[PDB]
Ligand binder design. Structure first.
Ligand SMILES: Nc1ncnc2c1ncn2[C@@H]1O[C@H](COP(=O)(O)OP(=O)(O)OP(=O)(O)O)[C@@H](O)[C@H]1O
Ligand SMILES: Nc1ncnc2c1ncn2[C@@H]1O[C@H](COP(=O)(O)OP(=O)(O)OP(=O)(O)O)[C@@H](O)[C@H]1O
Ligand SMILES: [Mg+2]
Ligand SMILES: [Mg+2]
Lengths: 346, 352
């Protein structure tokens, strides 16, 4: 009866994420239908409850990881965020792939029943992609094969709580898995298969760089692309659902500055406020900063860097000073033409 | 009492659509196994050595589907394990007799009943030696597993651990002979298709050659039907291990007519499961005849076996599944072939 409205979740996520549409929808739909699977898991001839593992392709600073924690805060079942580099197949020190389940168990108080009703977010999945075999890819291809069966759903003897200086079993049948990585190079892959011009008089000729497009190219991704990247065909299939995130936008960067609950601006304001200066900005000022981030091609992270440099001088002077009450920022300050202006009053 | 092969075959036909060859081989195996286990005493029979069968099918060919549905019909022990985690090279990790230990849980530590169990060690392509000639850093999850597993398939006593490992140093380790435990090893050999084609035509260069094309996906499911022991060794399987599995079954690829059936024919067919979920809130979900057929074409253009089917259905209804729950006053939502074409959107009746 819970039935948390798809929009409710989407809007809760909209409080922090500012711009993603496909991602918030797919997950919210997934979350909306995941409860139903467990809610109606009784024997009404609906017993297979086939799961569809989600994927999150896209570039950096797209909020791939931000969603998982915010999702965790509105999730009543167990949830954990896992890393891929740490995991390796057995026979190497690494980290055992099944260990990912143990992490979830701890958070749910080793409630096996509850544990089988949790979600996971395996970040940096693009890292384990294989090359193109000569030697065992303990961290790449190997990891995929080990995780392969887990995604489909098998039973394992997750370690039991207690150092112990009975190897309880746990089934993966109804444990949804979501893998989101910052795949680098996939844009080129899709561009090549779609159109790869070749020298010739009667052969189509196209530029190596396809209209200098990065965003919106992920929407054309297909299973073959992932296989070229290095993902094992079997693994590509294990995750039926695929999603994509645009790179960025000028409007989206101006909104992220203030709109999000825990925006970067608030942190600086809070800090400056405790220093005794009223941190302030301007509308055009905020827009100017966004332009800089787009040139850095670093994503949302870029924003932070720009702010610090402009405010480095002020963050070094203001503390010693005990007069300034308000510090405003103008487009001229972002441009650098002027120096950070202050109001020596109080 | 032993059910006739045909019976088992038809039971599994209810879910599997097109694995006639595989369904027949397994049927004989279960049928002859029961007989052996039911006539295992001293009546003109000395050892009646078990015949271990192998399975090789493309992705999403139902290899996994068969074993669970098979398990539900079996009256003897049955366990599903994986070779990927097993890394027996006498260095670290699980051992090979722990796979039968899972079987003992089904048997409740019944030593005799364990000898009547069945095995499903799949994913035998993950242990295939990279080159078959170890040169540096002797494999841990490769050659080792093959060598270690060799003994069990041939048969040998097994020191399976008991329920716990703290009461006593030994806790009366159960002793279960393996010779009488039929092994059914089914793995998806990704790459065998090219290996077999190397033996079909040894494409050289010249007028009098047998030059082969660089793609063989059209005949990927047919490649398995031409498999031979020599091809398995090239892929990296120890020749000894190949011999321990005399029979080599094969699974074919899929068809546009077999995908349409799987969409609705099975008990928990994808379409049924989609409608089932859609029906919990109370909105009826229906699809036209041509609507379902459209999904089959897309499935064959993804080379993602039956799994691709599910994926396609997700994309077809994403925006509506987001709206439908909150969008009350929707008697039913019919689907058409246009919806799969991408021209029209889900037909929302939006009426009492
Ligand atoms: N849509 C967005 N709205 C607001 N902030 C965002 C958005 N996308 C990213 N961010 C910011 O980016 C930071 C998190 O970056 P994130 O972890 O999503 O990168 P990533 O895509 O996971 O990179 P990688 O995949 O390499 O880890 C947060 O501080 C967050 O404020
Ligand atoms: N012949 C078939 N008939 C009906 N359903 C099928 C068939 N083949 C595959 N499926 C469906 O595909 C899903 C997953 O397929 P499955 O895991 O059996 O493929 P697989 O052979 O194990 O692939 P891999 O060996 O690479 O893991 C199952 O839930 C099943 O319903
Ligand atoms: Mg991240
Ligand atoms: Mg399989």
């Amino acid at each position: 009866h819970k039935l948390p409205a798809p929009k409710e979740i989407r809007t809760i996520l909209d409080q922090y994420v500012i711009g993603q549409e496909r991602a918030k929808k797919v997950l919210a739909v997934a979350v909306y239908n995941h409860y139903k699977r467990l809610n109606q898991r009784d024997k009404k001839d609906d017993i297979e409850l086939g799961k569809s593992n989600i994927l999150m392709i896209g570039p950096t600073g797209s909020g791939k990881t931000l969603l998982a924690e915010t999702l965790a805060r509105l999730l009543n079942v167990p949830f954990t965020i896992a890393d891929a580099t740490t995991l390796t197949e057995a026979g190497y020190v690494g980290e055992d792939v099944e260990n990912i389940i143990q992490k979830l168990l701890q958070k749910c108080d080793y409630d096996v029943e509850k544990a089988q009703m949790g979600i996971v977010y395996i970040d940096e999945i693009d890292k384990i992609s294989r090359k193109s075999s000569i030697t065992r890819d303990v961290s790449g291809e190997g990891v995929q094969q080990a995780l392969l069966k887990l995604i489909e759903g098998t039973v394992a003897s997750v370690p039991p709580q207690g150092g112990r200086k009975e190897f309880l079993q746990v089934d993966t049948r109804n444990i949804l898995f979501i893998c989101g990585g910052a795949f680098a190079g996939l844009e080129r892959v899709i561009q090549n298969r779609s159109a790869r011009g070749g020298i010739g008089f009667n052969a189509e000729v196209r530029s190596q760089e396809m209209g200098k497009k990065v965003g919106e190219a992920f929407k054309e991704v297909e299973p073959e692309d992932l296989v070229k990247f290095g993902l094992i065909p079997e693994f590509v299939g294990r995750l039926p659902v695929i999603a994509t995130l645009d790179e960025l936008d000028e409007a989206a960067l101006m909104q992220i500055l203030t709109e999000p609950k825990n925006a970067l601006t608030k942190q600086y304001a809070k800090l400056f406020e405790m220093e005794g200066v009223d941190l302030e900005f301007r509308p055009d000022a905020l827009k100017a900063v966004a332009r800089k981030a787009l040139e850095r091609k670093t994503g949302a992270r870029g924003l932070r860097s720009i702010l610090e440099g402009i405010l480095l001088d002020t963050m070094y002077e203001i503390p010693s000073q005990q007069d300034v009450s308000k510090v405003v920022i103008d487009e001229s300050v972002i441009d650098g033409s002027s120096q950070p202006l202050m109001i020596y009053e109080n």
